[PDB]
Amino acid sequence: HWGYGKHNGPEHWHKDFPIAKGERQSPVDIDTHTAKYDPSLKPLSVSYDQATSLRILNNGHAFNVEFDDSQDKAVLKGGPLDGTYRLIQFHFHWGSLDGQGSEHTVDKKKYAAELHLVHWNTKYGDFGKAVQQPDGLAVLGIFLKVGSAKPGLQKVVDVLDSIKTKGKSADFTNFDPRGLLPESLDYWTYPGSLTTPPLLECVTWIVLKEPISVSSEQVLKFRKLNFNGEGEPEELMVDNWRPAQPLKNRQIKASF
Numbered sequence: 685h686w687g688y689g690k691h692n693g694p695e696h697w698h699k700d701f702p703i704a705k706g707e708r709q710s711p712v713d714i715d716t717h718t719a720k721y722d723p724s725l726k727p728l729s730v731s732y733d734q735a736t737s738l739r740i741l742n743n744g745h746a747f748n749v750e751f752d753d754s755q756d757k758a759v760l761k762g763g764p765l766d767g768t769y770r771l772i773q774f775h776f777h778w779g780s781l782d783g784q785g786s787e788h789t790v791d792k793k794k795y796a797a798e799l800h801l802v803h804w805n806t807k808y809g810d811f812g813k814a815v816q817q818p819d820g821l822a823v824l825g826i827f828l829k830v831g832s833a834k835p836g837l838q839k840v841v842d843v844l845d846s847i848k849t850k851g852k853s854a855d856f857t858n859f860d861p862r863g864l865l866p867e868s869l870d871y872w873t874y875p876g877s878l879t880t881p882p883l884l885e886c887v888t889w890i891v892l893k894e895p896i897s898v899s900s901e902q903v904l905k906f907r908k909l910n911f912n913g914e915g916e917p918e919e920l921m922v923d924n925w926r927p928a929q930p931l932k933n934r935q936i937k938a939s940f
């Protein structure tokens with residue numbers, strides 16, 4: 685099944701998942717000079733005060749912090765979005781080297797990594813029904829750069845030990861995702877897709893302009909994770925990122 689290697693990577697996904705070549709695929713290059721400041725766009729509202737994390741899983745491509753999403757607690761609304769969207773999970777995409785890893789790029793610039801907080805549209809009942817809808821998901825993309833430690837990431841950094849290999853999960857309660865946000869909520873927005881298979885075209889993307897900084901030691905630990913399961917030849921979880929895809933007529937809008 686799919687991966688990020690020479691024989692199962694992004695260039696191979698289209699065969700099992702035809703939509704890999706579809707009309708609204710992610711990620712894309714954000715051409716900052718072509719993106720249009722949109723005044724019809726209400727301010728963003730990120731409300732993570734009640735967010736209830738349950739666990740962190742190595743899924744064989746990334747690790748997911750998962751959230752209790754059967755009540756309205758950690759919610760995204762405002763900006764490009766109509767109604768409310770509930771936080772289901774967060775995860776990252778990173779490189780082997782500081783010079784790559786982000787999925788979205790900004791005037792062709794690849795950041796060291798990118799965080800996705802994944803939210804689903806409440807009017808659709810649950811995650812599984814939302815991903816059948818064109819406005820089913822909202823993902824908040826946040827860029828990572830290597831510099832100072834991000835304090836609010838360190839609790840994730842240290843549990844990674846427990847979930848080195850594919851399949852492993854660990855209890856991960858009381859994590860506050862607010863720690864992971866930059867100061868400014870300025871963003872770009874476009875209609876797009878999951879960046880992994882099934883690659884469903886159900887996402888409103890909201891990519892924040894201001895990266896967070898993480899430390900070199902922080903990113904390094906990310907890179908100690910494994911693509912293989914326990915007992916297998918060791919493939920190191922690096923370069924788990926899809927490259928930029930064709931914009932295709934679509935317009936990216938700036939919130940600023």
Ligand SMILES: C[C@H]1Cc2ccccc2N1NC(=O)c1ccc(Cl)c(S(N)(=O)=O)c1
Binds near residue numbers: 746775878880
């Ligand atoms: C392990 C698989 C299986 C699965 C099931 C439900 C939700 C996410 C999810 N997975 N992982 C993802 O990384 C994922 C899910 C949704 C999205 Cl919107 C994205 S992403 N990369 O467009 O932000 C990733």
Ligand SMILES: [Hg+2]
Binds near residue numbers: 818887
């Ligand atoms: Hg969809």
Ligand SMILES: [Zn+2]
Binds near residue numbers: 777800
């Ligand atoms: Zn992602």
